[model samples]
Target: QKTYIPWSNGKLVVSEEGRYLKHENGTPFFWLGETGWLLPERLNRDEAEYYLEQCKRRGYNVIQVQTLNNVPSMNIYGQYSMTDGYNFKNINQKGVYGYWDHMDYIIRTAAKKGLYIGMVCIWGSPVSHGEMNVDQAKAYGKFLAERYKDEPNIIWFIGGDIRGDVKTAEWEALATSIKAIDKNHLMTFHPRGRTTSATWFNNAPWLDFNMFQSGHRRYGQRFGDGDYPIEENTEEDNWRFVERSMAMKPMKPVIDGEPIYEEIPHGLHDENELLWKDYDVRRYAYWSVFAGSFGHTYGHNSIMQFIKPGVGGAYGAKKPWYDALNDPGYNQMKYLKNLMLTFPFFERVPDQSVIAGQNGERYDRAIATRGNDYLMVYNYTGRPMEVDFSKISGAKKNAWWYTTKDGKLEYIGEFDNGVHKFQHDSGYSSGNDHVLIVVDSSKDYVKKDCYQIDTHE
Candidate 1:
């Protein structure tokens, strides 16, 4: 009700040309974000402020949050009433709830820090009982639109996991409703797992962008060294969705909303059961970027701190390894993100034909150039790869081993054929196993090109 900043094409633009999110007027915008869970009472106003400050310190530009959640107690603070379950009937949907108040504070705080909020509508599918029907959804959307119409740092994200075309009416109604009230910023769909956005929301008029979930699925099921075609390829499968989405809505940008989390529901052991290690966190990041996603999101299963252990805390997983912040995924992401800041990966465009991937499938093993400046490779399997960056003429410059701190190289030199023949000096065991190689043109007086890349706690 106070401000007005009209959207350009499919993205939110700014008055000055100095912001990090670069756009060519009518072109799609780029976003790099982290997922935050403030379910129940975790992210109160004060807590939201603290977390938002931390996010800005970490060079993050976006925050994604759910306004409603299942708190331990059946009672909610505002219009959210519960009868047996959290019901929306008597609970007026238009009420200015306590939760949304906290969210508005957080969004305002984020805007002050030059960050945007990818606000999710309702968690899970809206077709379930006690959800907004077509008309109700429209009215709810109108309420939201009027409420945050002036907030330039908000992007509308609908569908928290509503898959299946059987509920076509529900999907159309929700999207149509939101678009009707809010057409100031961009819009996107967050489809459930085992699917891509193109399969469902690509044709929708309200869908200004696309987002997908490569979540807790079978790891390395296909695309390694395979004689047959596998539907679930590694990095290639997800990247294809991005490239295709961009092609379809050439004006809209597409991104992977959720990648492999450091801690989600996973197996206790084996490849199918990922231990949520640090290396696992980064492999997914580079893999997506290599496949041509404009942006990537980072979140730790534990460090995001969704669980707190008390006498009977509602969400704590009291089994093995409850401490979420200290895992391999934490510092691994720290090192990975810090290293990524050294380059301009966001501006580059890959040359697909010259790209090289794993021996098995193009999806998992493929690597390409963002333009001519950099060439990225992704190897998810437990095999050493020899990527032919020889074709990348611009990459033939001075570089350092990304294996150890920018200047160190003695560590990975000992390993041959991507196999570490010697014991690692890092105290943690898994730290030695997972490594990401980088090719840079900075620094000198070091045997350059690329380094034998590995990380530590």
Candidate 2:
């Protein structure tokens, strides 16, 4: 049986069930992460605080960033992280404040704001630049881990979009060194796109959870001049990763570390053309959550690259990082979090067998999840959908339409138990995206205060 712990302090622990993460106080920690890959090495102390405050206001509780943003490894001020170009031995690279003063300030600030930092020790591609070797990486890992061991809000992210296969020995050594010293926080690998931590080190004791990258690919895009064509329905492929991780042994929580980023090109193959909108980002978030992910991560092209308008971007970032913060997609994520927290969190389980409508299509697909007293069916297209009520236990069921666009609920009245069809309202615009919430009203459920966005900007 699941038990509750009193609010002891500010440490996190994986659930006894191994399916979720919870704080020491028994409150579930929904890992709503925003990708700020360049957070530490790109922004100054004041700018970093601005970014952190934005995330806190948005109901985002985690930020993923790198210790060294890239090979050049220079912060906003012209101080290099290492003295010589790409030198790992001289880590005394500090700014005007002191030794590595900026990173220290950022970490402390995130702590004060109640956010977790998924600190990537090193980017994997550094080896290709002749700057990193296995020996120095392990040593640096030890130093970094020891230095930050007392920080309450840190989760060490080992590999940086680099496949574990290519850097197997190096990753193992670096992770091993860190784990040996700092046993306070959780550790996991951020694998390359189309891959997961389970692909290489599922059984490794150091790995606390699995993170997969579904990536951004459009219907008919090729990787390069000549590569295999990509999947037509990218969102479908996104949920499959979560499902696969759910079936693994010695079960651990799973999450998509990266997905189709907001405002990015449709297939990441476009040049300022065919950009993704809010609907695409929402589909990835809800699809993976209902498919059995413990939590989800959100990313944007401008935010991840810390790009400013008029400055060239990695993909096709059209706006500055600040503007992208208020994008429609970023604002709507909290609705999903709010709705999930209202129901019984740990008891919910993915049950696709209960979906009775036109279940097999592309972007219009449906997914369902149920606890003992509550069930939620997400309609991707707000198309006409049905659910198997015989699978529900209530003599009477109450339903509501939870729209992704406006984050509001429209009541659908009560119905008797059996297979039932739910129609989308004709006037319900915003891509007809709806989440059907069916609940046994007898259960004691309380909706918590969800993150709210200010619209006056």
Candidate 3:
């Protein structure tokens, strides 16, 4: 039997306050996204069903994909996206399953499972190499909008791992062409490594929200790249991007579209570098969300590319994509989504003042967020910290130590409204992370005895 999912309530829309996403019928939408970049080009129908079913079970509501990896994109069925030059008119043949037929199947299949297909129209390399001009972008965008405009679970992504400043005019034409026909869905750009879409398109009328790729570089590992905007030795600070985007005018919601993927090399190009583990991914998720991101998008190096027997893997991916599905980082992302929805959804804001003293730097720094009567502080290293209880509207607060790796909740006794110190049972370490959840003793938002969150709710 299939359980009911709220995605069918109505199309998603920006909340009335413009700080988060919610359904038209007033249900808060927690954007738990997964990166399946090569879904349209690599996976067959059966394989796609398997992958999406796993995603659904793991609490992913959005699957980001690349619609066209190349200018003349070919699917597994040997059908090209464009029969001639940038013409999708006669691309479909009579009584023959074509490239678009497979894509439609994937979309419909995902919709049945209550997943939104975030379609990147064309990869950035093709457009940057002068294969798609302004006119071609218009035609391609129109075709995509016309075909998927009626889909209830479609979100348009204009750029694919490319900075918006590279092809400014073409990106605008593609965005405007789609907006002219499709008004029901939301749209945003997927920027290049270590950059945010708001840097270029914050004022664009077609941009519905902001997304940033925090990239896969550790601190002090810039490797001579000059386009980075953040200070040196702070490359892993994804929360800074969220802070910058929130300060922009017109106040649009923002998210980290791509963080350091699980199992990818630290510097991304060097195979000898240490691989990012599950704890690293967990840190990225909590740090970004507690710093005021609307939601987070998670990527796995193997899963994103669907690396298989014949297909070559990128970024030193070794395990098969299916084998990588059970990786700890992939399964643990659900805790972040479930925890966000278990509390008051709309009134939350990032408040560093909740920390009573000076916060630590880099890996030791803890991030905090709060609602009217509740607060949460994510400590990545399990370091002892003092929290100001007066930040929330509670005279007496009930606290719990929430484990990020396994989503277990342990109730701590109630305390008076004042500064209190918290330390987890585990010693200070990289993966010994915990979220201190404090709620007004008079409220029942978090049940004391509940061990794990019910994600279906």
Candidate 4:
């Protein structure tokens, strides 16, 4: 049997060390899975085993789990508590002593399933959950270090979206705890969904990756007009946010810790908002991957639902999400990620093309290619667009859609002479209805480039 040892360069890194996950073995590593929920202290042993199996069948590798994200609902048969409340503002049980018995078993099980867990230290606040505040947080960190000190498959995540304050003695306590326990892993904070890591996070020695928040709170309308030149107001593209994190004396790798929740509602109202479609989910995934994201992290809105077939009540979540944990839509995402890995899209990269400001009304950006000449074009509007393919010197030939007609993956024909278009056809029963164009060197890009993975990034 092979023992696990996590390393980046040569020397042993603490649990805070990180690798730019965007690429897998010199290619773009398509991160295709959810924040592996109900772990460690949350799930019952058998149920947890079932959950891990389901994730694997669906092509998942990265499982973003909070070692302590539990709340009142996290108890096993209502016996233990990982946190005090379901919400972050309040924490009670603190360290998850409730689930300690299954900790090693859960870790080993996930490992067997080829899953890389993003292990969070404390969920939000330690003081809120602990009686001794700083001291207790440190004690737990020490415990983790002693236990998983040498485990490399685990990625240590620091904060869980709680506010940061130098004076928040407890914050320092937790950070101190992990450092004391293990220094061979990479670490980053999980800020609130609306915020991003700035000067403070970068300056922390223990911190490695620059994490951002392109919240799912904006799910449905995520692909619309906004600060981003294309669609959506991307926190990833927010220069100040990225720069602040990167501005550290020696900037390290950065990634969107919590981008948008794939298949989650943007709240209430609107068709896309109330529910998410495949295209909607894939569009956001592509946006983050193509736009220089080191890698992407995903969260599904359904896990908390804890749905069981014919069981109407877990967390009152929708049925589709509950029972269909390995649903096609979700698993297919891994296929997409694998596609990038196959062609090594991460090796290519989003090349910068052109930028236009439309009369202060909207900002526009053209596709950016990487090392290869495959041009990536992003049009945020629903209107038809014409591009001079001749610009790429050999971008011409034809274009098609990875559209789903009749529930199968079918190519939706071609666009003519650089005048690629979509919109309500108008006058005729229906308009063209629009979508963006991602061009490649050949017409066989889809089938030819779709890749399968042998190893990992």
Candidate 5:
């Protein structure tokens, strides 16, 4: 518990390069986020605190929640997010329980815990749902922007799980309206499954970044197929989203805001199907940023649904939301977050060319990202990969394996520039997990926190 440094102190702004998020003081901000779609509306005060505590401990900096979340009119407190929820003229309920006020409390609480609120103004295709007409949408947006204008940790997530192209005018109206009052906080659109906000709004003046949803479905399907198990195979569907956004006419910071969640059924969430494991999440997280995402978002099935033990879960929740607090994936994410922060964040670029015979199959894919003097190659299969160590500036390079398992940095060896094969044997956990093979001139770059080395043969 260190002194809380409010985000306002160094308001987040796009790096002048327009490819990443940076603080006012010029430090890069890695958006290590978690999906708590119902945290604001579903959790009681105690439950909310517990959730936030777990997230903060797990090294997450942002929580994406819908203001009028899933089933907008329904909440655990028995009060709608707004009187006649979804209507602009409708009052933000306060009598029986401060439904809206509670959300404010949650937001402020997160800030105190060194977290940000990825605030969603409305959920999905508002215009099509008639949730708000153009005028009403603007009015509602104005109210929210004005009210939370001073909230430093807020990042406007304007759309929820819908194509920004579908309701172009309506989406623009709400976005522009919010922009009018709260020009301070950054804003972006959260698109539907397998789509990126850049699909239609890349040029929107109000959109500060582009967020893509690789989604909950299996990876092999065509980006818009919406079919799960489409052969039950893989990518950086997460990676592609970032690539698509980066390749757009305007370069904007991109993030996989809604990647596949851990503990959810693999194909269309069928309980009978294979469930996504911690390994899958690691692949998505590593694949994302290595492919040029600004940061990554992680989710779990039970947490997003806010399921209770015996409440009967959606798409088959195996654990209660509270129990999902310590998922293995939860702790593993911190390694990636901490690892990325230690790098020259904005200057890093994906360079798979440094690896010879890099696997093309999604499951065996090994992606590489590098800084001025450092190289990190993610080995998805934990198998040996050939690296051209000559890419190192010095004649020799200090190499280590950053295991996603326990965040340990195991020194490989100092080797001279040339092609080399890297491999790490694992008896600790599943042998098929991901490993980060890092090469740098200075051994100093490797964080000393989790240093270890095996007796080298």
Candidate 6:
């Protein structure tokens, strides 16, 4: 049986306005990414297929993976990524499958399923630790570009959970080398925790977008990194990163590459800390996207490393990776993607002025975004607030309460164009979230009885 493929439109590119991503044929692309960081090093052929299929069913279109976790990375079949120090000549055997061969299999399989494989060329730690230099980076990059440049579902990510400033020259060489050989793909940088690629590479000619890691820290858990950039006590506010990136010159599309992963420790190190739950993940997704992110990447503590029996887990993960696939947070991300694509795609903009009352801080802070005739305000704590309907186009608006948890829509009565108070009946509390969607009464973009938006197409 055949299915709809997203990339059938064409390879992804920065939209002409530079605030969003679209296919070469102009189909708006809302990136719903899954953090499969260790997929290349952990899963075998069959296991990889299972994981990719699961992701495809869950409405994920991009799988972020670490192409090389170490200088000499070994896969489940005992094949090394680099047999002779950044030289891939002997990496593949004639009749026998090898490391790069397995990677090829994953990429091709993902393409068949309409998923893009985001290749983080090499983990940043290895380069920062001096495992690879500029010349080696250039050679390895050239080899990668030459080999997979023709693949239709490939996106290049230069850095991996590390700062861009640490190995500036090496990262530049790697990115430039790939760009010189392959102009068919879009490239970006993945910066370290609490920092954005816009801080370093926004002006770089090779970068197509900006990505920020809002990280795993809670509101007051700074962890004393000494190089932290954002203000204290605002670590969990991921929308701030989006606002900053959108304000930069030569504006490019921005996304939260890595946010607080579901089921991970609050601070990401202590087992005693409270684990971030499904609701927390929902909050991050809506807050960032409503604040002006092109998309959001969701992660899980167990799924990222593919932890199984006899394998150690990080961030206090206990459930096996396969079992964690059914976690609530993993399945709920599709709603955000569906909601975005269901509305006006290219004309949407972050507009907090839609909220008539004072926006609260932290969880109570409502984030708003709107198109020409509609507005969406996400309230995580279900706080009662006055919305200024005058911000949109119509004199009368049809309102609906969109539940983020189950993708259900509840229609509210139409109201006149003025300040009106509204709140979810669930009451104000963490995780009691709802998106107040108000559209011009004349527009029927969303039906009163619609349960969920169709995203498979």
Of the two candidates 1 and 3, the one with more favorable TM-score, higher being better, is 3
The superposed Cα distance between candidate 2 and the true structure at residue 122, in angstroms, equals: 1.5
Please write out the lDDT profile of model 5 over residues 1-457, one tens digit for every residue: 3734547459999887778898888877888999998777678888888898788878888999987754344667786655654454545544545677788889888888888999887788444676677877787788888789998889999889888767777778889999999978999999887688998888889999999888676656344556442134543456767777889976888899988888887655457777788888888898898888888899998898788866777778869988888788866888888778765677788777778865546666678888767788887776677887766467668777777756777776777778888776864235356555555656455643448322110
Give a tens-digit lDDT track for model 1, residues 223-288: 246552225444325565565655664335557787756665442233334444455566566655
TM-score of each: 0.69, 0.90, 0.98, 0.68, 0.90, 0.98
Candidates' RMSD to native: 8.0, 4.5, 1.1, 7.8, 4.1, 1.1
The TM-score that candidate 5 achieves is 0.90
- The list of candidate 6 runs beyond 4 A from truth reads 225-227
Give the local distance difference test score of model 2.
0.77
lDDT of 2 by residue, 205-306 (tens): 989989988877754455556533224445336788887776888888889998888888866766666776788888889988998887889999899888
Per-residue C-alpha lDDT of model 4 across residues 260-289, encoded as one tens digit per residue: 444556542343444444444544455555
Positional deviation of 83 in candidate 2, in angstroms?
3.2
Q: For residues 1-457, could you state the per-residue lDDT of candidate 3 as single tens digits?
A: 7744656678889898888999889999999999999999999999999999999999999999999999899888788888888787887899998889999999999988989999998889999999999999999989989998998889999998898889989999999999999999999999998889999999889999999999799999966776657788888899999999889989999999999999999978898799999999999999999999988999999999999987768888978899999999999999999999999999999999999877888988989999999999999998889999999987899999999998889998899999999989997885979999999999998898877766744
Q: Per-model C-alpha lDDT, please?
A: 0.51, 0.77, 0.91, 0.50, 0.77, 0.91
Candidate 4 wrong stretches, greater than 4 Å: 1-19, 22-30, 70-74, 77-98, 125-132, 166-169, 219-250, 262-265, 268-277, 305-316, 320-322, 326-329, 344-369, 378-383, 386-457
lDDT of candidate model 4 versus the reference? 0.50
What is the model-wide C-alpha lDDT for candidate 6? 0.91
Candidate with more favorable, higher lDDT: 1 or 6: 6
